[PDB]
């Protein structure tokens, strides 16, 4: 069952996919049991990396943008984004 | 138009495959191999999450 599978993936990865808080074009990726860190992304051309908690330095943000637009790897973006957000907390 | 269809597409693309018929998770790997984590044990949620993420990146 799709919703049950989602619930299980959320519990295993502690990764929740939510609507953007600010805009309709953003996807918010929330990491952690308590939802302690998050990052928003958009593919509407105005920007790629949106807001995040904790906020990240320009070099970290440029690496994340490159993983999405140059390598086109959504998985590697989530692994790197998760590492950066947890390390910067 | 369920957002659960696209969410599952995202979760599978991470290389994490649910195999509940065998009470286990398949983690696609660093070395290009398959890691299998059972779910029918006393493993905490915290350990299982740590185990999975550690095997998705370099």
């Amino acid at each position: 069952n799709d919703a049950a599978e989602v619930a299980l993936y959320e519990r295993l990865l502690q990764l929740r996919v939510l609507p953007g808080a600010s805009d309709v074009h953003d996807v918010r990726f929330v990491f952690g049991d308590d939802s302690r860190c998050w990052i928003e992304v958009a593919m509407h051309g105005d920007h790629v990396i949106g807001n995040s908690h904790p906020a990240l330095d320009p070099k970290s943000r440029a690496t994340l943008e490159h993983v999405l637009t140059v390598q086109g790897d959504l998985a590697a973006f989530l692994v790197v984004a998760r590492d950066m957000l947890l390390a910067s907390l | 138009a369920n957002e659960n269809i696209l969410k599952l597409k995202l979760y599978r693309s991470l290389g994490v495959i649910l195999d509940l018929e065998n009470d286990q998770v398949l983690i696609n790997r660093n070395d290009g191999n398959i890691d299998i984590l059972p779910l029918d044990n006393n493993l905490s949620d915290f350990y299982k999450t740590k185990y999975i993420w550690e095997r998705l990146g370099k």
Binding site: L18, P19, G20, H44, L68, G72 | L6, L10
Partner: peptide, 19 residues
């Protein structure tokens, strides 16, 4: 592993999540 695919996928997901 393609930027056009990730672009259209994230466009699709933000649309469904916003609805």
């Amino acid at each position: 592993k393609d930027p056009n695919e990730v672009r259209s996928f994230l466009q699709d997901l933000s649309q469904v999540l916003a609805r």
